Design an enzyme around this catalytic site. Structure first.
Site, short mmCIF file in Angstrom:
data_model
loop_
_atom_site.label_atom_id
_atom_site.label_comp_id
_atom_site.label_asym_id
_atom_site.label_seq_id
_atom_site.Cartn_x
_atom_site.Cartn_y
_atom_site.Cartn_z
N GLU A 122 9.01 9.76 11.29
CA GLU A 122 8.54 10.15 9.62
C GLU A 122 8.50 11.69 9.97
OE1 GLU A 122 5.28 7.44 7.78
OE2 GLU A 122 5.66 7.92 5.91
N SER A 176 1.71 9.24 -1.43
CA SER A 176 0.56 8.01 -2.41
C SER A 176 -0.99 8.42 -1.63
CB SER A 176 0.90 6.44 -1.42
OG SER A 176 2.27 6.12 -1.45
N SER A 179 -1.47 12.63 4.32
CA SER A 179 -1.24 13.07 6.08
C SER A 179 -1.36 14.59 6.20
CB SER A 179 -0.53 12.33 6.84
OG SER A 179 0.47 11.03 6.29
N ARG A 191 0.57 14.81 13.90
CA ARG A 191 -0.78 13.95 12.54
C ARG A 191 -2.42 14.37 13.38
NH1 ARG A 191 -2.94 10.12 9.88
NH2 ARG A 191 -2.38 9.55 7.61
N1 LIG Z 1 7.98 10.13 -10.81
C1 LIG Z 1 6.63 9.59 -10.16
N2 LIG Z 1 6.51 8.56 -10.32
C2 LIG Z 1 5.24 8.18 -9.92
N3 LIG Z 1 4.72 8.83 -9.46
C3 LIG Z 1 4.76 10.70 -9.27
C4 LIG Z 1 6.05 10.67 -9.60
N4 LIG Z 1 6.69 11.85 -10.00
C5 LIG Z 1 5.20 12.75 -8.89
N5 LIG Z 1 4.76 11.54 -8.64
C6 LIG Z 1 3.28 11.34 -8.00
O1 LIG Z 1 3.95 11.62 -6.59
C7 LIG Z 1 2.54 10.63 -5.50
C8 LIG Z 1 3.77 10.03 -4.53
O2 LIG Z 1 4.77 11.27 -4.12
P1 LIG Z 1 5.86 10.55 -2.96
O3 LIG Z 1 5.82 12.23 -1.68
O4 LIG Z 1 7.06 10.86 -2.83
O5 LIG Z 1 4.53 9.99 -2.01
P2 LIG Z 1 5.62 8.11 -1.20
O6 LIG Z 1 6.24 9.09 -0.11
O7 LIG Z 1 5.83 7.46 -1.69
N6 LIG Z 1 4.47 7.54 -0.58
P3 LIG Z 1 3.85 7.85 1.05
O8 LIG Z 1 4.21 6.55 1.64
O9 LIG Z 1 2.03 7.92 1.28
O10 LIG Z 1 4.73 8.89 2.26
C9 LIG Z 1 2.56 9.63 -6.53
O11 LIG Z 1 1.76 8.91 -6.36
C10 LIG Z 1 2.14 10.35 -7.79
O12 LIG Z 1 1.15 11.04 -8.09
C1 LIG Z 2 0.95 8.50 6.97
C2 LIG Z 2 1.19 7.03 7.15
S1 LIG Z 2 0.73 6.05 5.67
O1 LIG Z 2 2.21 6.16 4.83
O2 LIG Z 2 0.38 4.86 5.56
N1 LIG Z 2 0.02 6.96 4.95
C3 LIG Z 2 -1.26 7.00 5.16
C4 LIG Z 2 -1.62 8.39 4.32
C5 LIG Z 2 -3.45 8.16 3.97
C6 LIG Z 2 -4.13 8.01 5.73
C7 LIG Z 2 -5.44 7.32 6.09
C8 LIG Z 2 -6.06 8.06 7.04
O3 LIG Z 2 -4.97 8.69 7.26
N2 LIG Z 2 -6.93 7.82 7.63
C9 LIG Z 2 -7.39 7.84 9.68
C10 LIG Z 2 -8.68 9.12 8.68
N3 LIG Z 2 -9.60 7.99 8.25
C11 LIG Z 2 -11.39 8.14 8.52
C12 LIG Z 2 -11.58 6.82 7.45
C13 LIG Z 2 -13.44 7.15 8.47
C14 LIG Z 2 -13.91 7.93 9.12
CL1 LIG Z 2 -15.37 7.56 9.81
N4 LIG Z 2 -12.62 8.99 9.57
N5 LIG Z 2 -11.63 8.94 9.48
C15 LIG Z 2 -9.71 6.91 6.64
C16 LIG Z 2 -7.20 6.61 7.27
C17 LIG Z 2 -3.06 6.53 6.28
F1 LIG Z 2 -3.80 5.67 6.89
C18 LIG Z 2 -1.91 6.46 6.08
MG LIG Z 3 6.40 10.03 1.94
#
Ligand SMILES: Nc1ncnc2c1ncn2[C@@H]1O[C@H](COP(=O)(O)OP(=O)(O)NP(=O)(O)O)[C@@H](O)[C@H]1O
Ligand SMILES: CCS(=O)(=O)Nc1ccc(CC(=O)N2CCN(c3ccc(Cl)nn3)CC2)c(F)c1
Ligand SMILES: [Mg+2]
Ligand SMILES: Nc1ncnc2c1ncn2[C@@H]1O[C@H](COP(=O)(O)OP(=O)(O)NP(=O)(O)O)[C@@H](O)[C@H]1O
Ligand SMILES: CCS(=O)(=O)Nc1ccc(CC(=O)N2CCN(c3ccc(Cl)nn3)CC2)c(F)c1
Ligand SMILES: [Mg+2]
Lengths: 353, 353
Positions: A122, A176, A179, A191
């Site tokens: 990623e 969602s 990062s 990261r």
């Molecule tokens: N058509 C849509 N449907 C849902 N969410 C949307 C849409 N367009 C924009 N968003 C926003 O974009 C966010 C998701 O963006 P995105 O970059 O695609 O993440 P993701 O890759 O699906 N999740 P992650 O696994 O954490 O990376 C959603 O949580 C919404 O806030």
């Molecule tokens: C890209 C992988 S993902 O797609 O699964 N997305 C995704 C996005 C955000 C996070 C959150 C994330 O990074 N944490 C690390 C740092 N945290 C804390 C919490 C308390 C304290 Cl005291 N200190 N630090 C919280 C969790 C995650 F776990 C996954």
């Molecule tokens: Mg993503």
């Protein structure tokens, strides 16, 4: 095979597709019907089924990639509908894929006979895709922009930003969750941390609080709302500014903090709640980004993901907030192809297979 | 005059009251009836009116203060009821006061004839009060504690922590909002930053989502809930851990992120929503605290405010999270008198007037 790059996220699947436009007479013959049907279906439709969309305005035209000229297309659909995507594949191949779903749905992709799935990092995909798109430009325009004079609305305007020397760079990926990446070289990036208060928090909380049934409806509600009906501000606690600590009276002291009072919960509108949710999430992302930038000693902060698509309220809030609270030391940057960089980076891994 | 220290916050008023216990025969004569009525009313009641409470377990007994022996009492009531407090004052004096309400309600306090109001710096009061209480001890016990072996529940236990040399110290004040303070010396301390996602966010969002009508009810609901019914975890996105970035499958990737699905919004309980709200707010506070500690180069992080009163779920989550995500570099610390330090520091300003 058709050249495809896929990023399967927690919410959305992003697909980059390279359409060759230098097909010879002999090449068109040796093309098989199903490939012709795929290319024609993708290039003659802008909606796919009920939930797939091609973002036509993002298309890169007459790109040279892997020794061929073509158009680069950008397509998205909900991860919830990936079963339909896979079933259409089975009813009709090296697939470079990234995101969490490349692991979660690996076995599902392998139900497509002889399909080779290459799961790609990623981080490698996001950085390579971001650097590549900026390098090729957006059809001659800048890929990267900022909001000039972000503090004064009568002047604030989108303006291009040069990333010819992109290092170092703090990348804030708002999907969602969130990062935060530190990019020091083309080979040195990491990261830093993340926060779970991301676009899924905006969408999930807004849906619970307002009953909205789409991201776009949540943004439409927020555009009509007043977040100060739900938030408790510095002036609500102090009666005015708190200059001793540099806090203006308008700063939010407690997000949703006025909702501890029952009469205020009974008068607040859905639109007010939607706007407070957007402001809460966006400000927290900005603040986490600022703290990481200070720790990494990086002053350029670029925001990616799809939380910011068709979301100029959040972009302008980030631009104003990073500049205001950093006393102008940090600059918020944005990218036209912000949701798609992982998918492009995945596509760019094709030659290594 | 009676010796009183007041901290008027956005949500709660905290009052520290020094009850002399070395009253002589002649001193008791020269005492006026209304002062006798005040002392007797405060020391013979544990609830005051409908919303005032004396925290009897926090009382410091046989303290020597300003050349006199007495008991130090700790009393709280909602800022919403400050009109009743002031009206009782008018129906029956140097007042050292801090918090935002010392400014907001200055004119209201001055409706009490001849009352002199001295507004004291919130930062000076918090630090002086915290250092003072730790210095005098909690009736011979430690004021400061931590959770030993916070990662393993069969072992995790509250244990005392020595603050005889408290510097440097990162203080995380969780009130309506959150303020983060860096304390380098008794004379050198500053507000680093803050976040608006604080105890008022927990209480406000929980009330909107569940209909709870008190902090205590919100905590009771959260104790029965499962936050993973509302939150999207790393294993929901990846199918398991994401070891490439050190993320365990149980980590929250998107707070409330499963609430983007209508069928999940229709099945989640109020108790699940309350717990997800508590987890979301608490984790974000921990993460902001960790980032500030890394930037300030401080490894002791002490949490104050009233968000943590009768809230062992949040305390244990902070203790586990700071230790886990810092790989053991940071220690979460807690204080028995956490809500009252501003009020004590205000009281300690009395001799300068
Ligand atoms: N058509 C849509 N449907 C849902 N969410 C949307 C849409 N367009 C924009 N968003 C926003 O974009 C966010 C998701 O963006 P995105 O970059 O695609 O993440 P993701 O890759 O699906 N999740 P992650 O696994 O954490 O990376 C959603 O949580 C919404 O806030
Ligand atoms: C890209 C992988 S993902 O797609 O699964 N997305 C995704 C996005 C955000 C996070 C959150 C994330 O990074 N944490 C690390 C740092 N945290 C804390 C919490 C308390 C304290 Cl005291 N200190 N630090 C919280 C969790 C995650 F776990 C996954
Ligand atoms: Mg993503
Ligand atoms: N009885 C209570 N009523 C309301 N909130 C409570 C109560 N007990 C604990 N709390 C929690 O404690 C938080 C307020 O703590 P507190 O330290 O008193 O802040 P404050 O001083 O009133 N606000 P601030 O101006 O930002 O400092 C509330 O938001 C709740 O989450
Ligand atoms: C103690 C005074 S209070 O009683 O009024 N409480 C109180 C508690 C928290 C806060 C919040 C606080 O500190 N912010 C400063 C830092 N922010 C941001 C935002 C975006 C970015 Cl990019 N960067 N930084 C947000 C606001 C506050 F303003 C008052
Ligand atoms: Mg306070």
């Amino acid at each position: 095979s058709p050249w495809f790059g896929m990023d399967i996220g927690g919410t959305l699947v992003k697909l980059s597709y390279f359409e060759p436009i230098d097909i010879t007479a002999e090449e068109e013959q040796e093309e098989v019907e199903s490939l012709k049907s795929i290319r024609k279906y993708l290039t003659s439709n802008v909606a796919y089924g009920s939930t797939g969309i091609r973002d036509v305005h993002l298309e890169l035209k007459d790109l040279t990639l892997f020794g061929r000229r073509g158009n680069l297309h950008f397509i998205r659909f909900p991860t919830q509908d990936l079963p339909t995507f896979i079933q259409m594949g089975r009813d009709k191949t090296v697939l470079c894929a990234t995101g969490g779903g490349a692991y979660k749905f690996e076995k599902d992709f392998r139900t497509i006979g002889n399909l080779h799935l290459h799961k790609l990092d990623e981080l490698d995909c996001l950085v390579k895709g971001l650097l590549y798109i900026d390098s090729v430009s957006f059809n001659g325009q800048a890929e990267c922009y900022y909001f000039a004079n972000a503090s004064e609305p009568e002047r604030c305007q989108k303006m291009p930003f040069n990333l010819d020397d992109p290092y170092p760079l703090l990348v804030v990926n708002i999907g969602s969750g969130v990062s935060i990446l530190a990019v020091h070289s083309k080979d040195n990036y990491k990261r830093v941390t993340g926060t779970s208060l991301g676009g899924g928090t905006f969408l999930g909380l807004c849906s619970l609080l307002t009953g909205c049934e789409s991201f776009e409806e949540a943004l439409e509600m927020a555009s009509k709302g007043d977040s100060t009906q739900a938030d408790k501000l510095v002036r609500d606690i102090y009666g005015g500014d708190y200059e001793r600590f540099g806090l203006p009276g308008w700063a939010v002291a407690s997000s949703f903090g006025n909702m501890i009072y029952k009469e205020k919960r009974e008068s607040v509108s859905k639109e007010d709640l939607a706007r407070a949710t957007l402001v809460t999430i966006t400000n927290n992302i900005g603040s986490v980004a600022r703290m990481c930038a200070v720790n990494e000693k990086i002053n350029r902060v670029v925001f990616v993901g799809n939380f910011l698509r068709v979301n100029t309220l959040s972009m302008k809030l980030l631009a104003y907030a990073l500049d205001y609270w950093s006393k102008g030391q940090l600059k918020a940057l944005f990218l036209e192809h912000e949701g798609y960089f992982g998918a492009v980076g995945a596509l760019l891994g094709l030659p290594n297979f």
